[PDB]
Amino acid sequence: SSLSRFRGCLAGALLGDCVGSFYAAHDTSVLRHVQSLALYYTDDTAMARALVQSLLAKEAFDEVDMAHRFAQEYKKDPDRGYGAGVVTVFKKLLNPKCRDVFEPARAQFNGKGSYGNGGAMRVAGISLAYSSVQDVQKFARLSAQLTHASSLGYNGAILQALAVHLALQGESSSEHFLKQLLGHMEDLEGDAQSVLDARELGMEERPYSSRLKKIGELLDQASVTREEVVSELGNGIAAFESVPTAIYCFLRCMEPDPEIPSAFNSLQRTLIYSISLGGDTDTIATMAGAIAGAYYGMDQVPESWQQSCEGYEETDILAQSLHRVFQ
Amino acid sequence: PAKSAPAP
Ligand SMILES: *[C@H]1O[C@H](COP(=O)(O)OP(=O)(O)OC[C@H]2O[C@@H](n3cnc4c(N)ncnc43)[C@H](O)[C@@H]2O)[C@@H](O)[C@H]1O
Ligand SMILES: [Mg+2]
Ligand SMILES: [Mg+2]
């Protein structure tokens, strides 16, 4: 609702991308270099920017406008760190051929679609534009399907958009937050498309719902190692091995951590802990940051961290514009 | 791969 939550959401995502990418590129050292504080953003922010700029330009989801903005952003800087798969979608959208803008995503991976976390890494803007939980699901799905036609991909984008949507409503028990997400994901993973996509990849049925139940079990435990978190939830490029991990980091870091100095606020702790899991740290931290930012607001975004991030001024402009146009 | 990061 508040401008502070909109600004905190997009700043938190930007910090996750910039700080997470810094760690993914360079092998107590983490805590030292964050206190030290330009950090460049990656494809996570480039695509989040294009998604938000599309929503502002059309004052609504427009699949053609958003597809064009994704393709143009890619053409302008193809080296930001895109998944090797998704670049095929941008190259199709850039060529002059007459097509349905959703067709390149559908053709990915022998027509099964991408289950990568790229649909989820950029989706937070949907939950700033659309207040209704039905619209959040509908437009998180459609925005994701421009690149990610697999339900294993777009259900991760829906889960991340729902987590941001819930975080914007403010103070919640971890139990209430998790139950709400589990209710939606058990519904979505029971859909024929979700069942079919899971089985055609030789996967467990209901990967999101299973990981959300494991999050509840992990949060109930007195202590859990990073190895156990990564073993159970993942830290990878697949949406189902990163989106629940981001949500775990958000829920876990509502409590202080004996291993993270008490000088760090809850938002900073969430980002530090998510990066400590390793793997696809840019994308896990951008998603944990979006949720934490929406929840804690701009008061917990440290100015020294925000001002170290490439494009933080434009991110703040876009948060304020979303608030004006849609709120 | 474990992650995606821009090239060195
Ligand atoms: C850097 O990379 C991650 C993920 O970004 P994206 O989700 O945009 O990229 P992709 O669509 O290329 O997906 C990531 C990789 O996941 C594997 N994949 C996805 N879907 C499938 C299917 N159906 N079958 C087999 N393998 C699949 C591929 O390896 C694919 O390239 C993010 O952190 C960026 O910053
Ligand atoms: Mg990236
Ligand atoms: Mg990455």
Residue numbers in the entry:
A (entry chain AAA): 18 to 44, 49 to 58, 72 to 361
B (entry chain BaB): 4 to 11
Task: Recite the paper's sentences.
Therefore, we chose to crystallise the hARH3 E41A substrate complexes as this prevents substrate cleavage during crystal formation, while retaining a functionally relevant magnesium coordination. The H2BS7mar peptide lies loosely coordinated within a groove running perpendicularly to the ADPr binding cleft. It adopts no secondary structure and makes mostly water-mediated contacts with the hARH3 protein.
Poly(ADP-ribose)glycohydrolase (PARG) and (ADP-ribosyl)hydrolase 3 (ARH3) are the main hydrolases of serine PAR- and MARylation, respectively, thus playing a pivotal role in signal silencing following DNA damage. ARH3 is the only known enzyme to reverse serine MARylation and is consequently responsible for the regulation of hundreds of ADP-ribosylated proteins following DNA damage. In contrast to PARG, the active site of ARH3 contains a catalytic binuclear magnesium centre. To understand the impact of the ARH3:substrate interaction on reaction efficiency, we crystallised ARH3 in complex with the chemically synthesised substrates: histone H2B peptide (aa 1–11) MARylated on Ser7 (H2BS7mar), dimeric ADP-ribose (dimer) and α-NAD+.
